[PDB]
Design a protein around this ligand. Structure first.
Ligand SMILES: Nc1ncnc2c1ncn2[C@@H]1O[C@H](COP(=O)(O)OP(=O)(O)OP(=O)(O)O)[C@@H](O)[C@H]1O
Ligand SMILES: [Mg+2]
Lengths: 239, 91, 87, 48, 101, 237, 240, 231, 248, 239, 232
């Protein structure tokens, strides 16, 4: 009886509506992000769109600024709003402070907006979790995850959405300094992270690759094919 | 005439119940029963006995004759917690 | 009609059921009656009895008003604690 | 009251004749009743 | 409905045109059909009907002959029975119908 | 029953149960005694410490040079009311250049507290205030219950276990008027000590004293400052 | 049940139950009477002293709305004090915008409309106090209006509000208020207040008087003690 | 109770607000935070409660820099804690701007409690987080604890969090007024290891001290290993 | 239950009011659109075909928004009118600010943002209208855009909304040749689909509206087919069906 | 069916507003009855003046409220709501006079009153005023006019009308009376109103309990008959 | 689904805005009203029956004008019809002020329906328990629309609303021809009301108004009398 209002505390001090908003994130396609020394990658599974529909409008990885990008989970309707407000915020921050927006700052503002939307009745929580990464630290790669609650955290590597637990365990098992020593190895690591929960062929794995002082580079199907071929070569070498 | 309420035990009461139900148990000497009591926030004495029984069962599963504090931690998990993103908001 | 005792009725009932007990002259039965809204005669008798037992628990030879208030609390199974936000 | 009726008759206290042990299940009311029956030294009647 | 209790779920969809013709020929077997009876056209005149409605059509076609005190039924009797049995009830208020564009 | 959820609902008996419940919230606080002589208005409060090595909570607040209160109830409401009275006293000092009379401030508190007891949107101010001060009409001891009804009292006591203090003040009502500062403070301390259980005693760490006098502004005595008043008290029988 | 939870819901038989409940709140309070002289209006309320620690005049129910208007509230004292503040505001606004003392009929109508406005909304509750307004001026004589939580207000030759309303009314009818002056009628008011007092259910009370008439040059003020005491003596002369 | 605990505007028959107490229950779900106030300074020790090795240990904030002379220890909801901590920082900057002086720990704690008081006072819900404000001022090193109701009080050695009760009891047994900073740190770390589910090391706690003269110091990894060596 | 208001989240994390609004869309009349190489079209079914109902607008289901955009409508009539009025307002506002026609997707995004705001803020029910969009723009050309009551849009080549949507969409996916459809073939396919999408036989012209979008000399003329050409398409489909059964 | 009667803005399954009907039933709570009759050149209203107490000031118990010099009213129902409605009516008349010059016609006057009642009954913010308003006034080119207009916001013109507890019986009596065409003279109009109220009430009608107000073409001013004229009308009625 | 039949801002599990159908049911329980569009004009006819002869029939008119060429007839709640006609007049005058041309009937109907929809989107505001039937003569062609509390508007050639509207609709499509004129339309309205009318149709009991090119005007009781005598 304590889960029908956002501003009502349960006897054990639980805001159950916020947790129910969290539950919507787990119903979205997985997004995997891992940062390297000179690379930040955003793995995303595709839902194998209908044969008679265009994928161009089902974009899940979007860039807030010229050098910060985010991948979300949960409902697309809330995610689009969050991304639009984040873009407006980074542009406004550039206007007031000529320095480019920081990935930490944009993460903090996204978390603040989510928190403001889970602070009163008559405002449904944003049921999306965002994986914000970027080289905005001017020489330092950063990765961030915003829970729909309004809390953000810095992760060396993290996963959100359906099957996030398995990918998180995988990454905890093999995210090492040696694994991310080069960009190609980091991209391969993203590929192995996404393969286990997304079993399928090509076009089901979308990777966003951003290099230092560069722009977002959504890998074409040919590139993910060559990387998955490389992974198959590695596993056949292992056997 | 007198209506006595048997509310859920507090931390001292939960520790006392843990000591009561582990007196016959073959436990180690370094078990922090206060920690176990704190890990069961709202749990009855029956749940404490179930935790002790499950700790003994865990230490029986592996061929060990002494139930370590790790077995009690696993039993607390299995009894209270079994029946992370939600806990991410609290810190 | 037998109605729920009012303030005067409750005070009179507590006076009746405390006649056999050694009670301080300082007990304000009018204050007790105010503190026991929606109490029937049986609940007022239980208030007196529980006040007597609370006095006996402390080893007090005579009852006090605070003993009666504590008995009022114990009749409805309520427990009073020092709340951390009530100062 | 059964063991030491003198502590109540001197002060004119009529002890309660009934208890309602209420609480969440498993909190130990039946255990307390069994403990009472273990040292009651009087006639204990459990009603089925 | 779980398997082991209900192993097979057999669905009975409304009869199609050929199924409706089969039901018509089954329930008009004892009826004295005239020479100009084309039961297939009656099947076509009953889209999305049920087996009970197909039988009701035969019953009402016979009842028309009963009304006229004859023991044979014509195609007209079947066509009027198709209309009498398959008469549906609509919204009757264009206000409610126009809530949804 | 079902008339117990809002302040804007009336019980069939003609009572507002939310207001009665707010009036109970005063009893959740510690006992506070306030009494006035001909020339002084002293209030004594008992302080509860949440932990042994935690400072005893502030119970007597400062409002102006001639207004002092003792809070017994919700801390949030107590601090809100204290802030409101401090602002009102500051406004009176700024506009009229004279100390705000205690009666007018207490009437303002009654008017402000009445609104939550009549319209939905906020709970009643669940704090009882023992306002003490000096003005042209002499010392004043006001008690402002959360029902927005305030009482001008010679010697009032509110909070938990305050009936014993009220009884003591009732017994020694006559002597209060013709008493000096020391005797008034001793009477207040005795009334407070009547509230304590047998085991507890009036120590310097849980007693706060606030005095407003003829030529003495409001002064809150805590800790060692209480000792001059505390020594000389007759031991409880 | 069901239709009495809010002040904006009509009962199936068509009665705002919250207003009746607020009335029952007024009936639970002590008796307050006001008698109109041939040449003024006299107020007398039975103010119980709940605890002896009070200050012989604390939380008085006699309020001065204006120089000539007095109010003799009975009921929820916080609501009564708020209504006195509203009446004072209305009188001050009338004086500022029109330049002359507000007529008692107009002031009673406006304060009643303010009261009635609180029985119209679900977000607010009806006032739990009933009060009577009295004033005197040679231009329009003596007037006495009683306003209850409903907001209804007509003039009264003599009215009572509180617990012993009925007994005070039975006794006040046997008084010829049409011709008596405000001197002996004060003694009469004290005597009626003393008649309407349980004295075995109510421990004690402090009688307080008030009046406005020709002898108080058209102004309303506390009845002087040097004649309030004699009114009390006449009340004691009556056995009850 | 179910009809009286659905809002901060409703009073229970006992007079209790059965929504502030739930906020106090919320702070019990956070990791234990321990602060000790000694003459030499104020120390703050907390439990990290790491959930994944991939998360950056510095990402989650339990002890923060309210100001150069005040540090705050967190326990409870992250969002409410962040809001309250930002309010504390803004208010300390405002006091420095207006009065050209560092605010007392009393005054900054009062400022935070002012925001914590507006839980439905018509300009929501109580801030389900307890803050341990520790620092030095003109009165010396001071430690203050704030609860969701906004009730704040000076504490010699307050422990908040999941293990508040046991850590507080052992703190009562182990604390004396003549304690120095080093023994304060050692005793706080011992108590933390007593009430911590996982074995104590340098990655599952963060230690912070504020001493007069020096500024807010948060112990680094090497310093943490140094202090946990003897304990 | 967890459907008292739109702001309520189910324990599984589902906006039950939003799902209710989408499931309610099937009550609306059948609307479909086919994207061809040379243009894009919309097809609608008139549920109300009473002889006492006069047809004055001829565009009850298909609305013109901009000189190069048009939209079909399926859902609540009042919400439909509100959304189309807002669509025209946004279109003219963008035209005033930028002095160029809207790139289709921006206007759809604006509507979807408005709808999402309606399903997010309390005290407002979700817009129970799902509407198809057609248009041409300089960046990607002809596009067919779908909108749901939740504000989730998506690019599509051929869809159907309203009664019996699933069957129409399935047969679209079955017999749509990507990149090999002309406007005439698209019209024939739309008529074939609408024939058995609705239970009414013979596909009466008065019960069906079709509007087509074309790019002629950089003008982007929006044409609503009159009864003559619709009847010609009906007879063409009838003769095609007769030819198909000749094999039987 | 019975669950829809708690909010005024909620429609019954049969399509009814039960709160409005309950407000209509609240009119009878006063226990009074008022009847209005329109003559050829006059409009007469009479109503009960119940004073069940010797200490009431009978001058202040009058239910006849003068909206303006040429517009009068009788208010039946709950007293406070009726007084609020007459204050609103006076304000409306004064505003109309200030804004348009010529005096407000009676029909327009409580048509505005009924519009206020209707906007009250549409938006659930305040309970409808449980009081029936009966208006009179001589209007040029139309002769006498009496309009009854209710909490629902329904206003109409009446040759004769009545509202109160004894409404249906009085209307039936007037139906029996206003069917026989006769000279509707001042004397005859007052007499027929008094007969209506007396017969429906079955009361000898002592002059102290009836209060009458009439506007005439000859004297287009609302005038309240005092004791002498009322007694003269009663004695002329009896003989 | 009785739990979703209360609020106006919630969707039923089936997806029905229940209060709108409830307001429509309130509309259909109103007084009968029929309007027919002829080749040369439009006729609006409603029955106006009082409970007694005690009511002035001419004081309240069910048929009211919006502009010189726009009429209004309703079936449902009169008090809501008054605010609706006031809003329609204001919208028409606003359009006239902006464009200096009498407002088109289609535009007037669309704006009035938008006003009707405005009350069907928030809790605490009740939908208009009245459906309007709007006449008009625009660009040399007759117009007839119906606006519902749902906010939907259509272009009825001829329809009957209110009580026994099914009978009136069944009479229509029988005696209605697309090539009639104003007098035949008036007669058709007279008979359409007749079978939905209880009792004698007096000159005071039925109110009609034509809406031809000369503009909308409410027929005086004399014209209704002679038309009825011709019909009778
Ligand atoms: N306070 C306690 N101390 C020790 N053991 C306890 C306590 N409470 C419960 N237990 C244990 O829990 C077991 C089950 O509890 P018990 O049978 O007394 O339940 P109960 O409170 O009577 O509940 P129920 O409502 O099911 O009757 C006991 O046998 C005992 O071992
Ligand atoms: Mg048991």
């Amino acid at each position: 009886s304590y889960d029908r209002a956002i501003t009502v505390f349960s006897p054990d001090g639980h805001l159950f509506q916020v947790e129910y908003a969290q539950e919507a994130v787990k119903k979205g396609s997985t997004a995997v992000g891992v940062r390297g020394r000179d690379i930040v990658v955003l793995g995303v599974e595709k839902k194998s769109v209908a044969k008679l529909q265009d994928e161009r409008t089902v974009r899940k990885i979007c860039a807030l600024d010229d050098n910060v990008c985010m991948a979300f989970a949960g409902l697309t309707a809330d995610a689009r709003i969050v991304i639009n407000r984040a873009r407006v915020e980074c542009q406004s921050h550039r206007l007031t402070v000529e320095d480019p927006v920081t990935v930490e700052y944009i993460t903090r503002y996204i978390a603040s907006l989510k928190q403001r939307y889970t602070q009163s009745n008559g405002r449904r929580p944003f049921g999306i979790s965002a994986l914000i990464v970027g080289f905005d630290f001017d020489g330092t790669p950063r990765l961030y995850q915003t829970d729909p609650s309004g809390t953000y955290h810095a992760w060396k590597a993290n996963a959100i959405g359906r099957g996030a637990k398995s990918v998180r365990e995988f990454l905890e098992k093999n995210y090492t300094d040696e694994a991310i020593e080069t960009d190609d190895l980091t991209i391969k690591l993203v590929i192995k992270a996404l393969l286990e929960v997304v079993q399928s062929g090509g076009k089901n794995i979308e990777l966003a690759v951003m290099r230092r002082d560069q722009s977002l580079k959504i890998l074409n199907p040919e590139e993910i094919e060559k990387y998955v071929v490389e992974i198959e070569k590695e596993k056949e070498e292992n056997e | 005439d007198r209506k006595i309420e048997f509310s859920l035990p507090d931390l001292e009461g939960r520790t006392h119940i843990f000591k009561i139900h582990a007196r016959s148990m073959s436990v180690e000497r370094d078990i922090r029963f206060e920690l176990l009591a704190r890990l069961c926030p709202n749990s009855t004495g029956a749940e404490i006995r179930s935790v002790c029984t499950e700790a003994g069962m865990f230490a029986i599963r592996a061929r060990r004759k002494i139930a370590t504090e790790k077995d009690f931690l696993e039993a607390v998990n299995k009894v209270i917690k079994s029946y992370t993103p939600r806990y991410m908001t609290y810190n | 009609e037998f109605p729920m005792p009012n303030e005067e009725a409750r005070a009179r009932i507590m006076q009746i059921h405390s006649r056999k007990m050694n009670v301080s002259p300082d007990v304000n039965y009018e204050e007790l009656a105010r503190c026991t809204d929606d109490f029937n005669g049986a609940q007022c008798k239980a208030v007196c009895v529980e006040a007597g037992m609370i006095a006996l628990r402390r080893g007090a030879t005579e009852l006090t008003h605070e003993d009666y208030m504590e008995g009022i609390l114990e009749v409805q199974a309520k427990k009073k604690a020092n709340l951390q936000y009530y100062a | 009251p059964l063991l030491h009726p003198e502590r109540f008759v001197n002060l004119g206290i009529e002890p309660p004749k009934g208890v309602l042990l209420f609480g969440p299940p498993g909190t130990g009311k039946t255990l307390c009743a069994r403990a009472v029956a273990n040292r009651t030294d009087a006639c204990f009647i459990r009603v089925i | 409905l779980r398997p082991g209790r209900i192993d097979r779920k057999i669905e009975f969809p409304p009869p199609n045109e050929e199924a409706r013709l089969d039901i018509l020929k089954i329930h008009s077997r004892k009826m004295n059909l005239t020479r100009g009876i084309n039961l297939r056209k009656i099947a076509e005149l009953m889209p999305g009907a049920s087996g009970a409605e197909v039988k009701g059509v035969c019953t009402e076609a016979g009842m028309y002959a009963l009304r006229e005190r004859r023991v044979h039924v014509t195609q007209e009797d079947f066509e009027m029975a198709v209309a009498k049995v398959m008469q549906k009830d609509s919204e009757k208020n264009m206000s409610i119908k126009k809530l949804w564009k | 029953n079902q008339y117990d959820n809002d302040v804007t609902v009336w019980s069939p008996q003609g009572r507002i149960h939310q207001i009665e419940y707010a009036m109970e919230a005063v009893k959740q606080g510690s006992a506070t005694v306030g009494l006035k002589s001909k020339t002084h208005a002293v209030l004594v409060a008992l302080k509860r410490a949440q932990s042994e090595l935690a400072a005893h909570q502030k119970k007597i607040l400062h409002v102006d040079n001639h207004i002092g209160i003792s809070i017994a109830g919700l801390t949030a409401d107590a601090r809100l009311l204290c802030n409101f009275m401090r602002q009102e006293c500051l406004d009176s000092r700024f506009v009229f250049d004279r100390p705000l009379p205690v009666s007018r401030l207490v009437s303002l508190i009654g008017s402000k507290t009445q609104i939550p007891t009549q319209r939905y949107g906020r709970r009643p101010y669940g704090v009882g205030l023992l306002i003490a001060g000096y003005d042209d009409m002499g010392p004043h001891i006001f008690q402002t219950c959360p029902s927005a009804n305030y009482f001008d009292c010679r010697a009032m006591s509110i909070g938990a276990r305050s009936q014993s203090a009220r009884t003591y003040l009732e017994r020694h009502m006559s002597e209060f008027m013709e008493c000096n500062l020391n005797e008034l403070v001793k009477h207040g301390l005795r009334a407070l000590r009547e509230t304590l259980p047998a085991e507890q005693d009036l120590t310097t760490k849980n007693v706060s004293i606030g005095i407003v006098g003829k030529d003495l502004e409001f002064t809150i005595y805590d800790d060692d400052d209480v000792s001059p008043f505390l020594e000389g008290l007759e031991e409880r029988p | 049940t069901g239709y009495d939870l809010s002040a904006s819901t009509f009962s199936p038989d068509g009665r705002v139950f919250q207003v009746e409940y607020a009335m029952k709140a007024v009936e639970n309070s002590s008796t307050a009477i006001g008698i109109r002289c041939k040449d003024g209006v006299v107020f007398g309320v039975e103010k119980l002293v709940l605890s002896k620690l009070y200050e012989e005049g604390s939380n008085k129910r006699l309020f001065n709305v204006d120089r000539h208007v007095g109010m003799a509230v009975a009921g929820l004292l916080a609501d009564a004090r708020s209504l006195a503040d509203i009446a004072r505001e209305e009188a001050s606004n009338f004086r500022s915008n029109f330049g002359y003392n507000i007529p008692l009929k107009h002031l009673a109508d406006r304060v009643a409309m303010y009261v009635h406005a609180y029985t119209l909304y679900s977000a607010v509750r009806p006032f739990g106090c009933s009060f009577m307004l009295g004033s005197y001026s040679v231009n329009d004589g003596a007037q006495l209006y009683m306003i209850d939580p409903s907001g209804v207000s007509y003039g009264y030759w003599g009215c009572a509000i509180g617990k012993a309303r009925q007994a005070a009314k039975t006794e006040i009818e046997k008084l010829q208020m049409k011709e008596m002056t405000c001197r002996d009628i004060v003694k009469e008011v004290a005597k009626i207040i003393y008649i309407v007092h349980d004295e075995v259910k109510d421990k004690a009370f402090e009688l307080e008087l008030s009046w406005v008439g020709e002898l108080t040059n058209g102004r309303h003020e506390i009845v002087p003690k040097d004649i309030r005491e004699e009114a009390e003596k006449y009340a004691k002369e009556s056995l009850k | 109770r179910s009809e009286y605990d659905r809002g901060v505007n409703t009073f229970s028959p006992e007079g209790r607000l059965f929504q502030v107490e739930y906020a106090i229950e919320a702070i019990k779900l956070g990791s234990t935070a321990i602060g000790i106030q000694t003459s030499e300074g104020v120390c703050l020790a907390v439990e990290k409660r790491i959930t994944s090795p991939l998360m950056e240990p510095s990402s989650i904030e339990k002890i923060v820099e309210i100001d150069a002379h005040i540090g705050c220890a967190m326990s409870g909801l992250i969002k409410d804690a962040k809001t309250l901590i930002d309010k504390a920082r803004v208010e300390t900057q405002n006091h420095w701007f207006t009065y050209n002086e560092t605010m007392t720990v009393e005054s900054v704690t009062q400022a935070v409690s002012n925001l914590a008081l507006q839980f439905g006072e018509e300009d929501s819900r109580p801030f389900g987080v307890a803050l341990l404000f520790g620092g030095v001022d003109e009165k010396g090193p001071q430690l203050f604890h704030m609860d969701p109701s906004g009730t704040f009080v000076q504490c010699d050695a307050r422990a908040i969090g999941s293990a508040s009760e046991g850590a507080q009891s052992s703190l009562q047994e182990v604390y004396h007024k003549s304690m120095t900073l080093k023994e304060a740190i050692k005793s706080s770390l011992i108590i933390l290891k007593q009430v911590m589910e996982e074995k104590l090391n340098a990655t599952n706690i963060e230690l912070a001290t504020v001493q007069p003269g020096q500024n807010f110091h948060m112990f680094t990894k090497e310093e943490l290993e140094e202090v946990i060596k003897d304990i | 239950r967890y459907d008292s208001r739109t702001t309520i989240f189910s324990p599984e994390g589902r906006l039950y009011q939003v799902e209710y609004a989408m499931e309610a869309i099937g009550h609306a009349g059948t609307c479909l659109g086919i994207l061809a190489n040379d243009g894009v079209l919309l097809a609608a079914e008139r549920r109300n075909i009473h002889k006492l109902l006069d047809e004055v607008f001829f565009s009850e289901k298909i609305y013109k928004l901009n000189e190069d955009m048009a939209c079909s409508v399926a859902g609540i009539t009042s919400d439909a009118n509100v959304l189309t009025n807002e669509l025209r307002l946004i279109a003219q506002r963008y035209l005033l600010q930028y002095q160029e026609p809207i790139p289709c997707e921006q206007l759809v995004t604006a509507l979807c943002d408005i709808k999402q705001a309606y399903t997010q803020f309390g005290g407002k029910r979700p817009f129970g209208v799902s509407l198809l969009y057609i248009g041409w723009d300089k960046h990607y050309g002809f596009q067919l855009y779908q909108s749901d009551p939740s504000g989730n849009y998506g690019g599509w080549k051929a869809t159907c909304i309203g009664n019996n949507s699933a069957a129409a969409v399935s047969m679209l996916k079955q017999d749509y040749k990507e990149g090999e459809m002309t406007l005439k073939s698209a019209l024939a396919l739309a008529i074939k689909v609408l024939n058995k999408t609705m239970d009414v036989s013979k596909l009466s012209a008065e019960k069906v509206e079709i509007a087509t979008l074309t790019r002629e000399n950089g003008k982007t003329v929006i044409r609503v087919l009159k009864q003559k050409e619709v009847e010609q398409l009906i007879k063409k489909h009838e003769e095609e069906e007769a030819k198909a059964e000749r094999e039987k | 069916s019975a669950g829809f009667d708690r909010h005024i803005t909620i429609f019954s399954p049969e399509g009814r507003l039960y709160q409005v009907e309950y407000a209509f039933k609240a009119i009878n709570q006063g226990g009074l009855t008022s009847v209005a009759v329109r003559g050829k050149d006059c409009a007469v209203i009479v109503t009960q003046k119940k004073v069940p107490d010797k200490l009431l000031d009978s001058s202040t118990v009058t239910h006849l409220f003068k909206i303006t010099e040429n517009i009068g009213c009788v208010m039946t129902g709950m007293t406070a709501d009726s007084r609020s409605q007459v204050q609103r009516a006076r304000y409306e008349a004064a505003n109309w006079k200030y804004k348009y010059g010529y005096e407000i016609p009676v029909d327009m006057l409580c048509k505005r009153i009924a519009d206020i009642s209707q906007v009250y009954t549409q938006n659930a913010e305040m309970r409808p005023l449980g009081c029936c308003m009966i208006l009179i006034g001589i209007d040029e080119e139309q002769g006498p006019q009496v309009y009854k207009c209710d909490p629902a916001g329904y206003y109409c013109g009446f040759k004769a009308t009545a509202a109160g507890v004894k409404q249906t019986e009085s209307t039936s009596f007037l139906e029996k009376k206003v069917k026989k065409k006769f000279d509707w003279t001042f004397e005859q109009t007052v007499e027929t109103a008094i007969t209506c109220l007396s017969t429906v009430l079955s009361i000898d009608f002592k002059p102290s309990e009836i209060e009458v107000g009439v506007v005439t073409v000859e004297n287009p001013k609302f005038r309240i008959l005092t004791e002498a004229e009322i007694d003269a009308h009663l004695v002329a009625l009896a003989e | 689904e009785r739990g979703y039949s209360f609020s106006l801002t919630t969707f039923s599990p089936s997806g029905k805005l229940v209060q709108i159908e409830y307001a429509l049911a309130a509309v259909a329980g109103g007084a009968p009203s029929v309007g027919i569009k002829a080749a040369n004009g439009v006729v609006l006819a409603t029955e106006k029956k009082q409970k007694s002869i005690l009511y002035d029939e001419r004081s309240v008119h069910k048929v009211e004008p919006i502009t010189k060429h726009i009429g209004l007839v309703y079936s449902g709640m009169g008090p809501d019809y008054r605010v609706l006609v006031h809003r329609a007049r204001k919208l028409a005058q606003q359009y006239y002020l902006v464009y200096q041309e009498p407002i088109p009937t289609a535009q007037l109907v669309q704006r009035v329906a938008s006003v009707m929809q405005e009350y069907t989107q928030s809790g605490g505001v009740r939908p208009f328990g009245v459906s309007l039937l709007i006449c008009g003569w625009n660009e040399g062609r007759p117009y007839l629309f119906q606006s519902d509390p749902s906010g939907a508007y259509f272009a009825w050639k001829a329809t009957a609303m209110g009580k026994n509207y099914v009978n009136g609709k069944t009479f229509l499509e029988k005696r209605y021809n697309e090539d009639l004129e104003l007098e035949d339309a008036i007669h058709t309205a007279i008979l359409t009301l007749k079978e939905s009318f209880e009792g004698q149709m007096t000159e005071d009991n039925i109110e009609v108004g034509i809406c031809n090119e000369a503009g909308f005007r409410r027929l005086t009781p004399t014209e209704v009398k002679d038309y009825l005598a011709a019909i009778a």
